[PDB]
Write an enzyme that holds these catalytic residues in place. Sequence first.
Site, PDB file in Angstrom:
ATOM      1  N   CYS A   1       0.820  -1.210   0.000  1.00  0.00           N
ATOM      2  CA  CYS A   1       0.000   0.000   0.000  1.00  0.00           C
ATOM      3  C   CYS A   1       0.858   1.266   0.000  1.00  0.00           C
ATOM      4  CB  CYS A   1      -0.941  -0.016   1.204  1.00  0.00           C
TER       5      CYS A   1
ATOM      6  N   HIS B   1      -2.076   0.717   6.970  1.00  0.00           N
ATOM      7  CA  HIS B   1      -2.527   0.875   5.593  1.00  0.00           C
ATOM      8  C   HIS B   1      -2.379   2.335   5.197  1.00  0.00           C
ATOM      9  CE1 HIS B   1      -4.400  -0.517   1.928  1.00  0.00           C
ATOM     10  NE2 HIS B   1      -5.355   0.392   2.006  1.00  0.00           N
TER      11      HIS B   1
END
Length: 140
Positions: free
Chosen positions: A23, A73
């Site tokens: 990510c 994330h």
Amino acid sequence: APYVYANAKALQDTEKVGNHHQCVELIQHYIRVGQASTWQQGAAVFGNKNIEVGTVIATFVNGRYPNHNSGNHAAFFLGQDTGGIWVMDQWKDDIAKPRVSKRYIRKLHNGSVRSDGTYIRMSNNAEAYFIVELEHHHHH
């Protein structure tokens, strides 16, 4: 909003990027945000009436990106409503995430930050996301 990719909305269906398809590596491919260990927690995303499409956002705990947590994330902000946020992201799973694509991250029932700074189902918790900022001048 210190990082804003004005073309983040165009990334839908592009090929995943970076050396591990992670990510953070999506952000880093298009924008020099640096390593996530250097990030400072900015303004909250969910409820923020000022955040621009394409703002770089991430999960933050106790002021910092939680590299130590499997729920960390990062993503590009796309929009929000009363039930959650839409982001543009990627991760390594070539089956669930074959391309860079949009997904809906909900505000969970009783999903607010806990006393120890953590969030249930953090990467899927709209309240865990904050604008990625630079460390201020009063760090050493």
